[PDB]
Write a protein that binds this ligand. Structure first.
Ligand SMILES: Cc1ccc(NC(=O)c2ccc(C(F)(F)F)cc2F)c(-c2ccc(F)cc2)n1
Length: 304
């Protein structure tokens, strides 16, 4: 449950008046609640009014909301979805986040991939270029560095759990609806429990262990998703065949658009032994340089 997992190991929360939040329309809905585009007044200076994404809590779940909001208030970084605070006067209780114009990273990758149907404000016509793909991956890594820095275990790192804003700014974050919107990205064990198996290392599938290291493995899989324009990992396999391949040491193939150097960052996250796995700091440091490298050096990395 991500935020919940960090709470089960271990207020500065900003409050917003209901009259300062004006609900416009729904963006999505699930089981834990729904998301609305809203207009927020007197939130930030030199703006007066601004657009935000509002999570409306759908029982003794009100206490959960408060600790989640406390955790979200602490979790502030350039590549973590900005949390503005809560509205606790009257029901439904709301969490207020920034509005991310391009939506989740998976949706954005596929819409700028070779399988997209078809204007070009933040990015060029046709599929994303190498430079665009690298900057994307680096921001996700930066965000994961801040999380390993604060010693936070995500448990569900995937491009569907990242968001894209104006000027191609990518941040880790979701509104708790991935299980409803991307149900095929989870394996239903029984009753309620749904696991993102295609993104999980052998110790999370086999031993049910979740760490900072199972999170670097997921990043490796996120790196693969970036270079395949949001394709589902092990798409050719059923849930049981995918569990089998992961537990039997199989590695995901090198994507077409992926340079051997980027594939080496991936393979480093995919070491069977959690200890052997490369730290997120170095995975990020390796990606920052690859992203901020001259086009002369970049063009020699991408062939054909
Ligand atoms: C059922 C479910 C599953 C997963 C969720 N996401 C998280 O726990 C999560 C969100 C954000 C970040 C980061 F890094 F951006 F700070 C890290 C995370 F692990 C949620 C969720 C619950 C409350 C909420 F305000 C937002 C999302 N709910």
């Amino acid at each position: 449950s991500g935020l919940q997992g960090h709470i089960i190991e271990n207020a500065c929360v900003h409050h917003i008046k209901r009259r300062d939040i004006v609900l416009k329309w729904e963006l999505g809905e699930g089981a834990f609640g729904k998301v609305f585009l809203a207009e927020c007044h007197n939130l930030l200076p030199e703006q007066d009014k601004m657009l935000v994404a509002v999570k409306a809590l759908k029982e003794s779940a009100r206490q959960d909301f408060q600790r989640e909001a406390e955790l979200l208030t602490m979790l502030q970084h350039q590549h973590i979805v900005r949390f503005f605070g809560v509205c606790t006067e009257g029901r439904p209780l709301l969490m207020v986040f920034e509005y991310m114009r391009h939506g989740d990273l998976n949706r954005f990758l596929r819409s700028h991939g070779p399988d997209a149907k078809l204007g070009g404000e933040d990015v060029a016509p046709g599929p994303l270029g190498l430079g665009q793909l690298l900057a994307v991956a680096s921001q996700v890594a930066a965000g994961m560095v801040y999380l390993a820095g604060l010693h936070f275990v995500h448990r569900d790192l995937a491009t569907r759990n990242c968001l894209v804003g104006q000027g191609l700014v990518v941040k880790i974050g979701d509104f708790g609806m991935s299980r409803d919107i991307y149900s095929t990205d989870y394996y239903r064990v029984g009753g309620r429990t749904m696991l993102p198996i295609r993104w999980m290392p052998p110790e999370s599938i086999l031993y049910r262990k979740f760490t900072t290291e199972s999170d670097v493995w997921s990043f490796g899989v996120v790196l693969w998703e970036i270079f395949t324009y949001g394709k589902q990992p092990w798409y050719q396999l059923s849930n049981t065949e995918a569990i089998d391949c992961i537990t039997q040491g199989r590695e995901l193939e090198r994507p077409r658009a992926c340079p051997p150097e980027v594939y080496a960052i991936m393979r480093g996250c995919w070491q069977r032994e959690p200890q052997q796995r490369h730290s997120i700091k170095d995975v990020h440091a390796r990606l920052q340089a690859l992203a901020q490298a001259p086009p002369v050096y970049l063009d020699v990395l991408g062939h054909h």
